[model samples]
Target: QWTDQSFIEMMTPHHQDAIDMAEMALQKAEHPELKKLARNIIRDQEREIKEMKTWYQQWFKRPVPALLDALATAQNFDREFIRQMIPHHQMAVMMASNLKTNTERPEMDKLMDDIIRSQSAEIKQMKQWYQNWYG
Candidate 1:
């Protein structure tokens, strides 16, 4: 019973979690590379959030769901960001993976593909970095 509207409703907040976490990183992260990645995430995810919101309003005739509060905070900055974001990204990848059968539109399918490819690679990179730094 999964539909495009339901998929978007779920993903809207999922992207927001990423945005909130990245915004925390911008304020708290010390590493130059981490800050750079945070900036990119904020920029890119904000764009996607808006796109989804617009689609929801136009197609569903309702306001898109509000973003949830961030799942994790940046008390320790680097360690916390990596720890939170890897799993956040994993959840997004899992959601996108599950939606493969729920969508038929070219753009939606491509977006799912992009999310899987990009987030999975990012997860691998973050895990390696976490091991190097924390182990």
Candidate 2:
């Protein structure tokens, strides 16, 4: 049921959410390390989104939709970033997990594995910080 196009469609905006959050973070974040992290997220996820958009169009013979706007606001900056991003990364992990049981290319498998490993670890770190900072 999950074609490459469908996968791309789902993950495109998921990646965009991260990019959008990063954009807001750059504007509002005070911590230099957090700002650097946000910058890298923008740089890396933008490149990935672009590559996926190109591949999706070329293979599916249709243009992908534009990235969705960021639903979470940045009024609280660091706390809000962690709040929105933990769930954002969780959604990426959820999408990747859904693809695991379906048919997929080897590259897709690798991609999902990487997403699970890295994002899950980040989620843990974020949650810990959330507890320490927000609780």
Candidate 3:
């Protein structure tokens, strides 16, 4: 029911928030790989954000109608990044999964698949870090 317009709207800012945490990782993350991961997140999500915003503008004339929350930490920035990103990534997966409510658009289907694959992977990776460090 909320695919196409709703998913795009739900996702665009959601992606930005993920990128926002990734942005934090670049500066605050102490783990060696976290910064690399953060850069990757920024590159991926920001690019998708542009694609989505333009698509919404082209297909959806006029303003948006309806929408969409967060986690943060400090002291141990890498741990914080991991802790924060797990749920952030999960939420994107949830939205993407729900968007598949039979959106007829082929491109949207691909986008949803991409989000599921990419963010789901990150969620696992973050969970691993949490296990290794905080567990």
Candidate 4:
């Protein structure tokens, strides 16, 4: 059931996983801008975690639990890391896509567009790096 609670709950891990992946990228990405972008992902995701927590409090009437850490010590830029993160970014894209369809406000739409563009570009970067570095 895609009730509000489960959706928000799942996002907790989902966003953290993205942060985790980006942190890994930050460690090994060659380009300075890419490293900056990876760091931005971590910062932005941490803020979004707060936002999701607030949404949980207001809408689901529950305290948001800390997200579990699964990839904290994972290798930076390993094939396995890219393998794990591609789908993670895909999830972000999917969630943002949902907002594009469901959200009514212009501000919300703009936010979704930002997420979509940023994440899609990152996904491309990751895929290309995987081919160049590991494939």
Candidate 5:
């Protein structure tokens, strides 16, 4: 089920969800660090998306295909977005989890910790959004 195509398909939406999370913080938060962090999220994730697409094309032996526009419909609340996003977050979480447990590069270790903290914090906000929106 998780072929290169599916991996890329999943990761495309996943990266976009992370960008959305960062944008939400940009809209609501006043902290300078959070704003800077949000910018990094948008930039880095977009770069990763480009990489993922290239990998997909290379591995699948075809041109990378188009994906659906993610923000076509309005999300009434953050949860509608978060629900669409949790699995995407989960995938990134899993990747970070792997890095946290397995990687040895000091730079990568620091980067992994940053991702874990930033993403986990966003995950909590996303869950809260889910509760506020649905419960």
Candidate 6:
């Protein structure tokens, strides 16, 4: 049972996890392409996090809690980074795919579609690089 607000509440932390792993990629990943993806994750998701938090304040009148997450470490830095991020991005795509149509706000619906598109493309790109580099 998810209200429109519930979706944003869930997504706020989810984006933070993405941002955290992306930050790790900056320090750890060697591939320039992977590093570029890392910056995009931080830049885009950080903006959305701020947007969601403000909307939460206005709509629900509360602060959201935030994380570095489980996939924060890797021995095979680039390999592990790609491995972790593909599944991570899938969750966002899944979340958005299901919720986009269910959203009440026009802006948030727009947001839902936005995430699904970008993240899937990112997912595909990561899969390509994973095979080309690791397999």
Task: Give the winner by lDDT.
Answer: 6
Ranking of candidates on TM-score, top first: 6, 3, 1, 2, 4, 5
Give the TM-score (vs. native) of candidate 5.
0.52
TM-score of each: 0.86, 0.81, 0.88, 0.68, 0.52, 0.90
- Residue-wise C-alpha lDDT for candidate 6, range 1-135, written one tens digit per residue: 456677787988889888988898888888899899999999999999888888878887777644233344556788877777888889888888777767778878888877988899999999999999978
TM-score, model 1 to reference? 0.86
Each model's total of backbone clashes: 0, 0, 0, 0, 0, 0
> Which stretches of candidate 6 lie above 4 Å from their native place?
65-73
Tell me which residue pairs clash in candidate 3: none
Worst 10 residues of 4 by lDDT: 68-77
List candidate 5 segments past 4 Å from native: 1-17, 20-70, 75-77
Clashing pairs in 4: none
Write the residue-wise lDDT of candidate 4 on 1-135 in tens digits: 244455557777888877876776677655565577678789877877777687678765778765423344544445656677678888878887876776555554665676688878878987997788767
lDDT of 3 by residue, 82-131 (tens): 76678878888888888876788877888888889988987888888889
Where is the poorest 10-residue window by lDDT in model 3? Answer: 64-73
Candidate that scores best on TM-score: 6
Give lDDT tens digits, candidate 5, residues 1-135.
244455456657777867876787577544455567568779877876777677667667886565613433444433344565566666676776665666444544564566567667766766765676568
lDDT values for all models: 0.79, 0.77, 0.80, 0.70, 0.62, 0.83
lDDT of 4: 0.70
User: Model 1: per-residue lDDT, tens digit, 1-99?
Assistant: 457788898898889879888887787887777888888778877887777788778888999766422324525678878878988899888888888
Tell me the tens digit of each residue's lDDT in model 2 across 16-135. Answer: 878887887787886665687788778867877887787777777889966423334535678878878888889888888888668457767877787788778778877887787778
Candidate 6: residue pairs that collide: none
Q: Which residue runs does candidate 3 get wrong by more than 4 Å?
A: 63-73
lDDT of 5 at 126: 60
Q: Rank the candidates by lDDT, best first.
A: 6, 3, 1, 2, 4, 5
User: Which of the predicted structures, 3 or 4, would earn the higher TM-score when compared with the native?
Assistant: 3
Judge candidate 4 at residue 114 and give its lDDT: 68
Q: Tell me how far the alpha carbon of residue 66 in candidate 5 is from the true structure, in angstroms, after superposition.
A: 14
